[PDB]
Structure 1
Amino acid sequence: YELTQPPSVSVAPGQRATITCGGHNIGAKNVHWYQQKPGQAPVLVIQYDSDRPSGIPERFSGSNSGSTATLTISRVEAGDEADYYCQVWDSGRGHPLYVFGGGTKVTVLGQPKANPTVTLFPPSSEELQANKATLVCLISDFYPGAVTVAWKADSSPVKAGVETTTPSKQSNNKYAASSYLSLTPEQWKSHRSYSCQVTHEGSTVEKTVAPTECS
């Protein structure tokens, strides 16, 4: 059984946060919701679609109908910033299971929006001479701290060989993240260019490098 959540939501304090969880006829299921802050275990915030466990503030509510379950945080507060996960049980045609959604990173806005700076380094001559190649995409000075990174060879997306870090705060309190594409020297020199594309809050910035050009 598949559960689909949006990767991220941005919400100002005092406004309403809406986190959805899609599934085929999910309204025929019971949905449970969890809150998880960095370095911590999850906390159950809504159970059985709409019920608040004891100790959960009344600004958390839930509903479920058709193909969408919804966690709502009314009058959201700074401390509600967290990742939120939905969950269901399924009878599994005789082999019962639980499944989680992919999670939604809910940022409660606490500083000004900042658009990312992207710096893409080609493989160094030193590394190429060691018979290896790494493209290094560094993403800095952004807020909210949520991005998607996509790599391309020429125009074709590349998934294999990629590793990306979760954003964390810089000295100046904005976020930075990093992504790497590991290639052989042959792969590097056999395409016209490679690109790192960063999506932040609905828009994208792309940097490109080329094996034949001194970046």
Structure 2
Amino acid sequence: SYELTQPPSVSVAPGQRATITCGGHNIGAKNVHWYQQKPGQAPVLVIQYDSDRPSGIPERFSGSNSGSTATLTISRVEAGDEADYYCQVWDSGRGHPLYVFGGGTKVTVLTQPKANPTVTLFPPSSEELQANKATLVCLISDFYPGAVTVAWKADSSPVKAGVETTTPSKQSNNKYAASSYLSLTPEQWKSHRSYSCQVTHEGSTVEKTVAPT
């Protein structure tokens, strides 16, 4: 179906302007609506029909839509604007109409210094292997802002199946931690030369690799 593309995250210092884009083929021909969602709450409509603020939404929220990109702008951002933001359009769906949401952008308001992630990757243990199972454990700690993307590769090719990744949660020292797990069979583990866990954070990546040897 019609697809919407949002960046996973946006980091912004207090008072700066936050820009969240929503890409779609000729999305300028559609009405785009924007929803804000804080944790454990329901979404809130903050921009409707490309650029209209519903009643009660601060004037620092604004939106535009042109060509292949719609944009939600949060001017003079405040700490309380930290949330996930979702774009949305209606589509005719070849006589089967639908709504589609973008994947959502986590907007972090920078209230503490940037911290690069520590990545620890463990291969499957002999005990787990000797029990006909295999798990690669990728542990990600002491990073801020709390948004990462984890990609796995078998040798060189990406692997999506068997991957479970947590949502980053705050540590005791107020930084963030997360973990990603790759499940596979002992044979796929043995069949490849190596496996890699790649962690993307604030535009940079830390990649660790392990091998059956």
TM-score relative to the length of structure 2 = 0.96
Task: Give the Å deviation of 1:79.
Answer: 0.4
Equivalent-residue separation in structure 1 for 2:51 and 2:105 (angstroms): 18
Range that drifts further, 169-178 or 186-195: 186-195
Q: Residue 115 of structure 2: SS of its match in structure 1?
A: coil
CA distance in 2, matches of 1:127, 1:23: 45
**Offset, 1:202:** 0.8
Greater CA drift, 90-99 or 51-60: 90-99
Task: Give the drift of 1:152.
Answer: 1.4
What is the SS of the residue equivalent to 1:188?
Answer: helix
- Give, in whole Å, the separation in 2 of the partners of 1:64 and 1:184: 47
Provide the rounded CA distance (Å) in 1 between the counterparts of 2:189 and 2:93: 46
Q: What residue is the counterpart of 2:38 in the other structure?
A: 37
> In structure 1, how many angstroms separate the alpha carbons of the residues matched to 2:205 and 2:78?
29
Question: Which residues of structure 2 form unaligned runs of 5+?
Answer: none
Q: Residue 12 of structure 1: CA displacement?
A: 0.5
1:93, distance to aligned residue in structure 2 (A): 3.2
Deviation at 1:17, TM superposition (A): 0.4
Q: Distance in 2 between matches of 1:157 and 1:61?
A: 38
Superposed displacement of residue 95, structure 1: 2.4
Q: Distance in 2 between matches of 1:190 and 1:98?
A: 43
Structure-1-length-normalised TM-score: 0.95
Deviates more, 1:140-149 or 1:83-92: 83-92
Deviations 1:44-103 (A, max 9, x none): 001111111111111101111111111110000000011100111122333222111111
SS, match of residue 53 in structure 1: coil
2:141 paired with 1:140: yes
1:109 aligns with 2:110: yes
Q: Distance in 1 between matches of 2:161 and 2:172?
A: 32
Structure 2 residue matching 1:130: 3-state secondary structure? coil
1:102-132 residue CA offsets vs partner (Å, 9 max, x unmatched): 1111111111100000000111121111111
Which of 39-48 and 88-97 deviates more? 88-97
State the identity as a percent.
100
CA 159–92 in structure 1, closer or farther in 2 if over 3 Å, else same: closer
> Which stretch of the first structure deviates more once superposed, 91-100 or 167-176?
91-100
Q: CA deviation at 1:190?
A: 2.0
Alpha-carbon distance in 2 for matches of 1:49, 1:186: 51
> 1:154 offset after TM fit, Å?
1.7
1:93-132 aligned within 5 A: 93-132=94-133
Q: What per-residue deviation string (whole Å, max 9, x for no partner) do you get for residues 181-201 of structure 1?
A: 111112212222111110111
RMSD: 1.0
